[PDB]
Amino acid sequence: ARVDQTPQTITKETGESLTINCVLRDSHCATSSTYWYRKKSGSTNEESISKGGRYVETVNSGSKSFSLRINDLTVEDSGTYRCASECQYGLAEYDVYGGGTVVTVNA
Amino acid sequence: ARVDQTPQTITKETGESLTINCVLRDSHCATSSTYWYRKKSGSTNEESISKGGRYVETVNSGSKSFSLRINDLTVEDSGTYRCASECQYGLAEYDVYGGGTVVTVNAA
Amino acid sequence: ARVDQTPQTITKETGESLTINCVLRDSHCATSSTYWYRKKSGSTNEESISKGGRYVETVNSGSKSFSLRINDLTVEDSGTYRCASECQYGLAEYDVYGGGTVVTVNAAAHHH
Amino acid sequence: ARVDQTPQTITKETGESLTINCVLRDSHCATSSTYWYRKKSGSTNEESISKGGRYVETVNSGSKSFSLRINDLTVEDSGTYRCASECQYGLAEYDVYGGGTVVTVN
Amino acid sequence: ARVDQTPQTITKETGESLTINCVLRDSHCATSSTYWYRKKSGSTNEESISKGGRYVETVNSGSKSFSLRINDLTVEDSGTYRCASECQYGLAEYDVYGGGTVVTVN
Amino acid sequence: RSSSRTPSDKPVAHVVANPQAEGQLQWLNRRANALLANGVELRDNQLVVPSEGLYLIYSQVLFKGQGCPSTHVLLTHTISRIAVSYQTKVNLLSAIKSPCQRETPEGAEAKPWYEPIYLGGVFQLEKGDRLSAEINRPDYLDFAESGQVYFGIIAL
Amino acid sequence: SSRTPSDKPVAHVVANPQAEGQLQWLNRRANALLANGVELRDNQLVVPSEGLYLIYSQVLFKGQGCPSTHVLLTHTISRIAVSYQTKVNLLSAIKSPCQRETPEGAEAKPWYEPIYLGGVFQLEKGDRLSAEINRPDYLDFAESGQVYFGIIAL
Amino acid sequence: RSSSRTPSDKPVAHVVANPQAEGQLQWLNRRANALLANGVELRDNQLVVPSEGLYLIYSQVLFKGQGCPSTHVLLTHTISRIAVSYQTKVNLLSAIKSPCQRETPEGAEAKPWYEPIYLGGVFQLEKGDRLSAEINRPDYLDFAESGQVYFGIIAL
Amino acid sequence: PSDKPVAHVVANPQAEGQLQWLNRRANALLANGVELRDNQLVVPSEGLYLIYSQVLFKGQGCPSTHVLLTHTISRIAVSYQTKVNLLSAIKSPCQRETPEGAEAKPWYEPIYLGGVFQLEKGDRLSAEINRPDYLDFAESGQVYFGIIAL
Amino acid sequence: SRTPSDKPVAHVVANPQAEGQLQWLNRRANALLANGVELRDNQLVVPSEGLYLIYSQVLFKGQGCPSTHVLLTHTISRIAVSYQTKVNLLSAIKSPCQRETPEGAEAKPWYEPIYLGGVFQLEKGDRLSAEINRPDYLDFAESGQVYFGIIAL
Amino acid sequence: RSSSRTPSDKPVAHVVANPQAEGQLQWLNRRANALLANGVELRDNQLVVPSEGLYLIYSQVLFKGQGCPSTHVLLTHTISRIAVSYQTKVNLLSAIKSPCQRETPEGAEAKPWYEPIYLGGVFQLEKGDRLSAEINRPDYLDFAESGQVYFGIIAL
Ligand SMILES: [Cl-]
């Protein structure tokens, strides 16, 4: 574990909306310091997805889960999206990641 | 701890029989009003075990100790089992509990 | 011979720490259900020592041995300490005990 | 070695008495918690010899030594005898053993 | 307080005499069970003064007072002397104290 | 750190007397070689049969005294049964023993006597029958060393 | 009898020499310690208080001749935590004792290879440390302190 | 939905190798079961001692290669110290290991060799001393799994 | 001002075929009561210590049969005055294949031991190896030995 | 039950499995509710006219102070048959945090107890009720830290 | 290597002082012509009788001094018994001896004196009785030479 991406492989068509869920399994990681990273298919320039507009982020502190809704899917929104969180207990502070691929086919 | 449930962790196989024993340490609780509760892992309901058939109970009023042997074990009988007793001395009335978990593994 | 309490006679000084070791010789008794009782010299009541804080318990199920290290000794901690364990095999269920005495001598507080 | 069993091989006749002596070399083991074990030749059971009657135990705390005299010897007392002691200093707790074989001919 | 020790600070020379008087202020304390305690200068241990020999005890129950006269004062008998009395009324029974110091030169 | 390694069934009971009971016969099962399982209840020093069937009933008692000046000493040991069908305590097994035939042990020093008594039999018991093993002189009980006094049943 | 008190959770367990083909941890031997709250459950060490610990273990592997080319000996100290209930490796080592060889015409070649692991970690209450090996059939717990495992609260 | 009230300590560090660092040994601290706290700082793949005192230094590296095509390969692993009093690289702990003693996989291959190296010792360090754990061949690192390569100090 | 008995001794490089421990060397310690007597460390106070030592073995070829490289830390105590091993390890450097009339192949095999033990006043620790002819004390900190009272 | 005893008495303790609420319980060791005292909806109903002794304790625990404006209150109130309005018999106020809004990430749990006690004349059917305004700071974890009781003197 | 070649019984003990004890009387059994066998245990310099019966108890002590520091020195030697029946130390055999006849070597120099004391008698002892051979002045003991000070019992 250490954060669990639920929709592993999704294949949607241009003009739709995919939701990606990540669930915290470490009771030291917080749903408050969540981050998102995208890697366009066939390129190793993993960028940081920004929270705003087409990319909406929902947090629920009760179930220790955060999700990332992506709207208006294009043919360039095909890649590998990973989630992240900041954990801190005593003298240790670290971060955790996931993994899950997105492919969008165009109409 | 008033009442001591002894087999804390059990792991038996399908088709077996587990014995869970409780000993009273409070000399005010009675072996006549004894109670048994099972709580299946993942459920939020504590169920009341009925005394008969698969559920056999052994009591000794001298030692203030009772047991609960459970036969024909399935794999859906995996959960936390607790024992209980009702105590009363003067103007006092209360009940007592324990703690102990069961896990049963399937077969083929 | 069914639980062996080793330090039978102990004499420590006020403010110190004694460890009592008990070894299970009956291979049906469990190191998970261990109990401790002390009886202060001159009084008739076995009280049950609780596991926490000043009363530290070390257990090894591999050799089926458990111990009880007691810190901050006073002069009111002088008494007979016994260990206990809960045994269970087939249709049989029983318990076992030991024996061992502690006497704590005072510090006398040097006056100038 | 920690605990020194001296008569390592004894061979007696039925109806006599073998004495096995053990001396402590570790000063943390106590002459108070002594144990004896025999394992009869051919069996996989180490039995614990109990002190009373036919099994006599002599202890001297000064020399940290104990002995085990066995009387009325039969032919069922053929095996390996070991002695034991409980040692304790600080945070350390252990036990110690020896070794020595007995054969009785009729 | 209860039990007023009157000579608070006294200064005598080796070869003189001191009487210390205590007057009861609690009407539950009795002049019958009176005790005296001194602490020799230098150590913080209370010794029990004996009511015989040098230390003579005079009691006057009418005035509810008791005293402790010392005949031959030496030089090491310099210290804080306190008086005591045992009181008992209803379900309560207790004791009471005072204070008074002696200094002896040569 | 252990559990059962074979099921085993039928009502069973083998209880041994309490050694730290100065002058009474209190039945115990929470000891090394004692049994009380598969439904058998020990109520007020009485065994309660949980099911109708054929049982084997037995008990042994050992009497010890350090001299007997009273010729008139009679030792009895009886297993009694009160059934749900006939609510009167009736004897199933009984025995009597005379320990003392002397000339009042006089002048010299004491002399301990030991007399044991054993009872056993097979009976048909019904649900709820209360069996009780009792003795008339519980001041001569010798439960000192070993399992010298006991009482038990087994559903065959 | 005892002497100076001493404290801190401490553990130094030694393999059972009389265990044939398995790794049983013991404390009731001369130079072994297990005190001040450390519990050894199912061949597992249970931390009694939260803090920084020093973890170490050595395993000695011995075989009488090399049968397989693809023989890999492993030794890991694992931790299953209360916050994250999955067993994760803290310290690990892998060792291949046999570079091909596989003695055909020979007279057995006994090999000895030890493995040592150590590190400092922050542990929580109830965490279970476990020292494990993949092939406990090559353990050489013969002479002395050749196999051991311990923690100490620093 | 939980609570935490845990204390702290003294200068400590336990860093783990970077798994996604291609053919290189990059030390990391922001990963599970890794520590870098109470003043120990990691600059240029080096640990900077925050206070003078007695320290315990340790490090392990795992070497893996997918064949032995050279009977003349040397694997070394050293923890060195450049100090404020003497600004020269000096070795505190060092070890050498020859991974391939055989006559190369001349026929079939797929013989992965694994050779670990461990270092440990206690030293007196001053404020500002920079400790560094290094290997001679960073192309044989096996950082594929977790806790295979690490390096740390702890203030005793 | 650092207390607690400590020791970290390193081998003498200019020592002919022997493992002689030195303390008056750059990065070595022997203080707060631990004394180095007859090539042995003497524990000055009862308590919990961390004992460690590493040895580096080097040879210029695999001679006849197998060589066993052993490295052991021993303790002779006042309570039980016989040398007993606290930590031990054995390693066989030569995987057979003794040089078959060809040229050498220098092998390196190090061995490390470490653990926590309870020591009493007057206990004598010694780190020792069986073949002091394979010691590689050419560099610094390749063979060393130390304790610290934790 | 081998002891007589009388006089209406009650000593109830909070239910630990209540999360954010103060439910008074009597069916626990060292708790009393006997000789006529009725407990309705978290309220004690006096069974007889006479002199009673009323007491209660609450323990408040917090993990951080988000606002200077923290007010902790504890009151034992009485609604009587003669005057059908709730009146306070015993009351106490405590401000646990004098500003000092904890800065950073320091988790320093604060604990504050409050105790009330007094003698009163109560009539038959009078309802006494012990309540607190912030049942979100109750620490009923350990044991006899929160309770409420009366005894007929 | 040899074997035993005699069978014998009856609890026996003949313990002799330790010469390497300096100023104390520690009893030894692991010396040439000394015995401690057949059940007798020696705890705190005390013999514990293992079985009830009639015993012969004896002990001798040798006192030596190289001068009298006073004309009022008293040498005593006693064998005591604390019994399970009556747990008070009572003297079974006792003797007193005055070593210095009006001297306290004043007009001349020091002078080595030797004075022995012997005790023996028959008594009935019970199981668990603790007998102790004791002296008041353990600094005048001369356990240098051979069997000069000893203590023993034998079951008749
Ligand atoms: Cl904690």
From Swiss-Prot, chain I:
Q: Residues in domain THD? A: 5-150
What's the effect of swapping E139K? Answer: Biologically inactive
Disulphide bonds annotated for this chain are C62-C94
Highest taxon of source: Eukaryota
What outcome follows a substitution of V84 to A/D?
Biologically inactive
The compartments listed are: Secreted
Q: Which residues lie on this side of the membrane: Extracellular?
A: 1-150
Could you identify this protein by its name?
Tumor necrosis factor, soluble form
Organism for this UniProt entry: Homo sapiens (Human)
Describe which stretch of the whole protein the shown chain covers, with first residue, last residue and complete length.
Answer: 84 to 233 of 233
